[PDB]
Curated annotation (Swiss-Prot), chains A, B:
This is C-C motif chemokine 1. Keywords: Chemotaxis, Cytokine, Disulfide bond, Glycoprotein, Secreted, Signal. The gene is CCL1. Cytokine that is chemotactic for monocytes but not for neutrophils. Binds to CCR8. The chain holds residues 26 to 96 of 96 of the full protein. It is found in: Secreted. Monomer. GO terms for biological process: antimicrobial humoral immune response mediated by antimicrobial peptide; chemokine-mediated signaling pathway; chemotaxis; eosinophil chemotaxis; inflammatory response; intracellular calcium ion homeostasis; positive regulation of cell migration; positive regulation of cytosolic calcium ion concentration. It comes from Homo sapiens (Human).
């Protein structure tokens, strides 16, 4: 019965986000990939970041993938 | 510091979803609107549905907007 929505990043973070501010990262859905990465921030906040930009790549290596559930 | 990801529906529910199966709805992000509606189902499941289709409109009227948080 599920037709999940896609997670897309059409606008990206200009300023560097401190690594300590991020919990984990999610990839954008493949249909709208656009080289974006989602960083999950504290208290449920979020930031799209473009994965071709230097700092985003280095931050990605120092984080784990955001967990999901099935309940 | 936030650059939220967009919620987009590029694929939609063909078959009618029972109203009792849905918790609430959310709108797709305006940048990728495409006349889609998101229905939140049980155990965190989800369904994109096209708002020009009859049943989706009638289901929408009998539901409330999905709540969000800020913590």
């Amino acid at each position: 019965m599920q037709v999940p929505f896609s997670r897309c990043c059409f606008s990206f973070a200009e300023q560097e986000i401190p690594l300590r501010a991020i919990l984990c990262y999610r990839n954008t859905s493949s249909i709208c990939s656009n080289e974006g990465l989602i960083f999950k921030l504290k208290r449920g906040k979020e930031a799209c970041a473009l994965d071709t930009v230097g700092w985003v790549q280095r931050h990605r290596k120092m984080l784990r993938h955001c967990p999901s559930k099935r309940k």
